[PDB]
């Protein structure tokens, strides 16, 4: 018994004692078998949501309308699912009926409270061979939930399996069915695919399969995707950095309309382009400017070089480290640090409050930062004063 | 800082550091103030669901569509809710806007990471006085969510507060609006109200208010409800035992159609009647019969006397203890224990398999139980054999 399932063993036990019968199901079994780090432990039972909400103290009702209940056990969250037949939903007592409904074979395994692998679908084979195959006709299943395709391809990104000949085919043939699946749902899938350790050949595949030109803004970029192979994807740390390079390697013009089609939250689509930009503007890592760094702010700066990295081949290590230095020597690091107040500039140049004031301070920080004038009140005063009679001699 | 919030303090802290601002909200504050045992710790913040899913590792998405996110922290489950205005939902930054939307004042409190109570609605007053008052016009709020009434009455059950004159009034005037709220939702509320420590005057109130005759099967039972006052509700330990007595004191004829209207699960409505029945059939605690006990099975037996208790005044203590003895002396306690097999009765009376067989075994347990014949094979054989030539001499 692996500690993953060890603590999770209770869930089963209590479900068995109340005469219910339960199994470990899903990837957790796969990962265990495959020999991956074990993800979410998932548990499937013949006990109805209501029976599970009676047995366990903490019970979160996520969607008792389609089988699942989240059971807080011993300080974790496990997803217990009453066996079902994907028709509304129909609940059975046949575990075999349940496995029978899942996307692919690697997923359709189950292990008993004792540790005996229950594989009525050749999951065990699939894994040794490392192949994503459909549970039943690949055709019928994609008709049963089109999204099942995207993920067949994400799995390729996430595990590094190959697709099954008849399964892959089925995708190109049934490609259209995607436009029927909500964008929201497509995005989360794209966003895991992207973080694959095999992303590199997931994306291309996304193309060789019919799947391209049904996903947001991925019309006819076939060439771009296949090429995407050389990108060091897996050193991208973050979602932004992800979307970031994804754009770049598509060559995507305006990041904003694109990432928005993907129904991504603003804060990403904003910081997305943020970096996409700083990247175009700075073509070289040595070229970062005390101004520019201050402007983008450490975190983003680094993320820039890490995207750059994923494009170049050049390890970001040293740059990250040079930026981290520079940024902690920038005589200020935010605008709020500026020893001098917007009101100070008014009482100083004897003008009414207005538009000029911004431009003033605008050019004061760019002075403090580039080390031109200190960040003390007195000196910035003279600095301002003495640069205003300069703007009289010049015109 | 009370331990409840102590561990929960982290949730706030990390939401503050990422510049977000959060508060403890809800009954947890009420309970703390009131000086009750502290229930669910709840947290409200300006950070959107997505921001909360980014910051914390474990993040359960219960309904990010209306603000709430369940954040698993340090081994518990806390509900973080992005401030909102109950219009679809609109998210703000104003905590004051958030409090302003909640049902009643006791609930509309908030405490900061430091321990400073934030009461912009006189919750603190309401609690000292022990009064359930509406946050704003009692009228408008019941139009905003009719169910708010049921609970204004359950709260009476739960805490032992009185209703505010203008609030109580508003209920009778706006009584009708209930039929618009899903039964499912009414039941859960009734199911808490019933377990109230003040249940006794909650039920009556449920009547003096317009609330009666909008709840399942509670048409015109006004008299029955008011009388319901004398029942020792609070010693009812279980759901069944609850519905059980509720039926009884309403005098409800057929339990089955009634409890079912409440959209209660079967296993309850079944065990519900179960007891309701055993109760009508056995009018006296001394009258339990080795048969009857074996038949209902300890647990339910006790439950029966516990309901009887809630009706009589007589403490179940002794009976429960007498039952628990008798039942562990019953020479068998289930039907599966019977040393004699249905197949044994066939190969013994030389008849084909059929309906008589049940009737045979049926009268064998009742013979093993009442201590008439042993629960060994040999002796039951004889016992059966010698009672079949008895049924020849008799007719
Ligand atoms: N379109 C989908 C998506 C998922 N599943 C099923 O839902 C379970 C859990 O879903 P998921 O979160 O995707 O976990 P796994 O598919 O098991 O793999 P992973 O945990 O890496 O996502 C799986 O066992 C799978 O059979 C499905 O039948 N159809
Ligand atoms: N119809 C409802 C039901 C609940 N609430 C709000 O949702 C929050 C949590 O709901 P609940 O689980 O009922 O907790 P409390 O009302 O605070 O009290 P208790 O924990 O005893 O149920 C509360 O702060 C309350 O203001 C609401 O505004 N309208
Ligand atoms: Mg888990
Ligand atoms: Mg999973
Ligand atoms: Mg809790
Ligand atoms: Mg609560």
Q: What is the DSSP string of A301-345?
A: HHHHHHHHHHHHS--SHHHHHHHHHHHTTSS-SSSTT-SS-HHHH
Q: Which residues of A touch B50 (CB under 8 A)?
A: 265, 267
Q: Indicate the angle between helix axes B239-250 and B298-312, nearest 10 degrees.
A: 40
B34 Cβ neighbours under 8 A, 6+ residues apart = B106, B127, B159
- Distances from the Cα of A47 to the Cαs of A51, A74, B369, in angstroms? 6, 20, 33
- Phi and psi for A110 in degrees, rounded to 5? -165, 140
Q: Which helix (H) or strand (E) holds B288?
A: none
A281 close to A273: Cβ distance less than 8 angstroms: no
- According to DSSP, the residues that pair with A59 across neighbouring strands are A71
Q: How many residues does chain B have?
A: 395
- One of 1.10.240.10, 1.25.40.10, 3.40.50.2300, 1.10.110.30 is the CATH number of A136-231, namely 1.10.110.30
**Tokens describing residue A116:** 């005996």
In angstroms, the CA B109 to CA B126 distance is: 11
Q: What residue segments make up the domains of chain B, in order of their start?
A: 1-135, 136-231, 232-331, 332-395
- Distances from the Cα of B229 to the Cαs of A51, B187, B310, B311, in angstroms? 32, 20, 11, 11
Q: How many CA atoms lie within 13 A of B115 on its CB side?
A: 7
Going by C-alpha positions, the residue among A346, A351, A381, A389 that lies closest to residue A364 is A381
Taking only Cα atoms into account, the Rg of chain A, rounded to an integer number of angstroms, comes to: 28
State the burial class of residue A290 (Cβ atoms within 10 Å of its Cβ: 0-12, 13-18, 19+). middle
Q: What is the bridge-based pairing of β-strands B68-73 and B76-82?
A: antiparallel
State the burial class of residue A180 (Cβ atoms within 10 Å of its Cβ: 0-12, 13-18, 19+). exposed
Classify residue B117 by its DSSP letter: B
Per-chain residues with Cβ under 5 A from ion ligand 3: A 40, 77
A355 Cβ neighbours under 8 A, 6+ residues apart = none
In angstroms, the CA A366 to CA A364 distance is: 5
**Long-range contact pairs involving B110-115 (C-beta distance under 8 Å, separation at least 24):** B110/B23, B110/B24, B110/B25, B110/B29, B110/B44, B111/B5, B111/B23, B111/B24, B111/B29, B111/B32, B112/B23, B112/B24, B113/B9, B113/B12, B113/B13, B113/B16, B113/B22, B115/B1
- Strand order across the beta sheet in which B68-73 lies: B59-63, B68-73, B76-82, B42-45, B22-25, B110-111
Q: Is the dihedral of CA B373, B374, B375, B377 positive or negative?
A: negative
A203 close to A229: Cβ distance less than 8 angstroms: yes
Q: How many CA atoms lie within 13 A of B37 on its CB side?
A: 1
In angstroms, the CA B334 to CA B354 distance is: 22
Characterize A199-208 residue by residue with b for buried, 16 or more Cβ atoms within 10 angstroms of its Cβ, and e for exposed: bbbbbbbbbb
A147 close to A154: Cβ distance less than 8 angstroms: no
Query: Å from A76 to nearest chain B CA?
Result: 7
Q: Is the dihedral of CA A107, A108, A113, A115 positive or negative?
A: negative
B258 close to B187: Cβ distance less than 8 angstroms: no
Give distance in angstroms: CA of B38 to centre of ligand 2. 14
A40 close to A28: Cβ distance less than 8 angstroms: yes
Residue B143 labelled as part of a binding site: no
Question: With left for phi above 0 and alpha for psi between -120 and 50, is residue B183 left, alpha or beta?
Answer: alpha
Determine, for residues A50 and B77 on separate chains, whether the beta-carbon distance falls below 8 Å.
Answer: no
In angstroms, the CA A298 to CA A340 distance is: 23
B175 close to B204: Cβ distance less than 8 angstroms: no
In angstroms, the CA A49 to CA A319 distance is: 53
A124 close to A105: Cβ distance less than 8 angstroms: no
A56 close to A93: Cβ distance less than 8 angstroms: no
B81 close to B44: Cβ distance less than 8 angstroms: yes
In angstroms, the CA B2 to CA B9 distance is: 10
In angstroms, the CA A261 to CA A243 distance is: 12
B43 close to B55: Cβ distance less than 8 angstroms: no
Q: Could you name the CATH architecture of B232-331?
A: Up-down Bundle (1.20)
Q: Is the dihedral of CA B294, B295, B299, B303 positive or negative?
A: negative
Q: Which of A184, A267, A271 to mutate to test the interface with B (most CBs of B within 10 A)?
A: A267
B377 Cβ neighbours under 8 A, 6+ residues apart = B339, B340, B344
- According to DSSP, the residues that pair with A81 across neighbouring strands are A44, A68
B80 close to B55: Cβ distance less than 8 angstroms: no
- Quickly count: other Cβ atoms within 10 Å of residue A191's Cβ: 17
**Tokens describing residue A178:** 């995607």
- Distances from the Cα of B49 to the Cαs of A71, B52, B182, B347, in angstroms? 21, 5, 27, 70
Determine, for residues B267 and A51 on separate chains, whether the beta-carbon distance falls below 8 Å.
Answer: yes
Chain position carrying tokens 């609850």: B242
**Tokens describing residue B209:** 């208010």
**Tokens describing residue B107:** 């609930």
Q: Which residues of B touch A77 (CB under 8 A)?
A: 58, 60, 72, 77
Q: Indicate the angle between helix axes B342-349 and B355-368, nearest 10 degrees.
A: 110
B258 close to B234: Cβ distance less than 8 angstroms: no
How far from chain centre, in Å, is Cα B309? 19
Q: What is the bridge-based pairing of β-strands A162-163 and A131-132?
A: parallel
In angstroms, the CA A264 to CA A190 distance is: 11
- Quickly count: other Cβ atoms within 10 Å of residue A298's Cβ: 17
- Phi and psi for B95 in degrees, rounded to 5? -60, -40
Determine, for residues B265 and A77 on separate chains, whether the beta-carbon distance falls below 8 Å.
Answer: no
Q: Which residues of A touch B72 (CB under 8 A)?
A: 72, 76-77
In angstroms, the CA B118 to CA B94 distance is: 13
- According to DSSP, the residues that pair with B117 across neighbouring strands are B111
In angstroms, the CA A151 to CA A190 distance is: 8
Going by C-alpha positions, the residue among B63, B161, B60, B143 that lies closest to residue B107 is B161
Chain position carrying tokens 């340090």: B74
In angstroms, the CA B206 to CA B215 distance is: 10
Q: Could you name the CATH architecture of B1-135?
A: 2-Layer Sandwich (3.30)
Residue B40 labelled as part of a binding site: yes
Taking only Cα atoms into account, the Rg of chain B, rounded to an integer number of angstroms, comes to: 28
**Tokens describing residue A257:** 């309309």
- According to DSSP, the residues that pair with A104 across neighbouring strands are A134
A370 close to A291: Cβ distance less than 8 angstroms: yes
- According to DSSP, the residues that pair with B132 across neighbouring strands are B163
Angle at B342 between CA B340 and CA B345, to 5 degrees: 80
Could you tell me which chain A residue has the CA closest to the CA of B73? Answer: A75
A332-395 domain in CATH 1.10.246.80? yes
Minimum-distance ligand 2 atom for the alpha carbon of B40? 20
How far from chain centre, in Å, is Cα B228? 18
Q: What is the bridge-based pairing of β-strands A110-111 and A117-118?
A: antiparallel
Going by C-alpha positions, the residue among A93, A94, A9, A95 that lies closest to residue A51 is A93
Four-point Cα dihedral A180, A181, A182, A183, nearest 10: -100
């Amino acid at each position: 018994m692996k500690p993953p399932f060890q603590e999770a063993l209770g869930i089963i036990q209590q479900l068995k004692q109340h005469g219910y019968d339960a199994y470990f199901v899903g990837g957790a079994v796969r990962d265990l078998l495959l020999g991956r780090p074990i993800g979410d432990v998932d548990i499937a039972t013949s006990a109805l949501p209501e029976d599970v909400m009676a047995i366990f103290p903490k019970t979160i009702d996520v969607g008792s309308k389609h089988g699942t209940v989240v059971v807080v056990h011993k300080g974790k969250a496990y997803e217990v699912t009453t066996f079902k037949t994907d028709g509304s939903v129909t609940f059975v007592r046949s575990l075999e009926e349940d496995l029978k409904r899942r996307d692919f074979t690697m997923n359709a395994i189950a292990m008993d409270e004792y540790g005996t692998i229950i594989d009525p679908f050749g999951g065990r084979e699939a894994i040794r061979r490392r192949i994503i195959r459909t549970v039943g006709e690949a055709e019928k299943r994609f008709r049963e939930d089109a999204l099942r395709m995207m993920r067949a391809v994400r799995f390729v990104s996430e595990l590094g399996f190959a697709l099954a000949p008849d399964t892959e085919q089925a995708i190109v043939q049934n490609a259209p069915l995607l436009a029927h699946i909500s964008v929201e749902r497509m995005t989360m899938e794209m966003e895991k695919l992207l973080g694959g350790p095999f992303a590199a050949r997931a994306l291309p595949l996304l193309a060789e399969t019919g799947l391209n030109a049904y996903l947001p803004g991925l019309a006819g970029k076939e060439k771009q995707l296949r090429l995407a192979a050389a990108y060091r994807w897996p050193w991208l740390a973050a979602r932004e950095e992800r979307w970031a390079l994804l754009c770049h390697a598509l060559g995507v013009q305006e990041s904003r309309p694109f990432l928005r089609a993907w129904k991504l939250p603003n804060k990403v689509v904003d910081e997305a382009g943020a970096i996409l930009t700083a990247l175009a503007d700075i073509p070289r890592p040595e070229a970062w400017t005390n101004e520019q760094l201050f402007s983008a702010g450490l975190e983003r700066a680094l993320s820039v070089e890490t995207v750059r990295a994923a494009f170049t081949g050049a390890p970001p290590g040293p740059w990250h480290e040079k930026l981290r230095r520079r940024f902690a020597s920038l005589p200020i690091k935010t605008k709020g640090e500026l020893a001098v107040n917007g009101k100070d500039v008014i009482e100083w140049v004897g003008k009414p409050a207005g538009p000029w004031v911004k431009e003033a301070l605008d050019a004061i920080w760019r002075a403090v930062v580039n080390g031109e004038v200190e960040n003390e009140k007195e000196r910035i005063y003279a600095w301002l004063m003495e640069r205003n009679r300069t703007r009289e001699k010049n015109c």
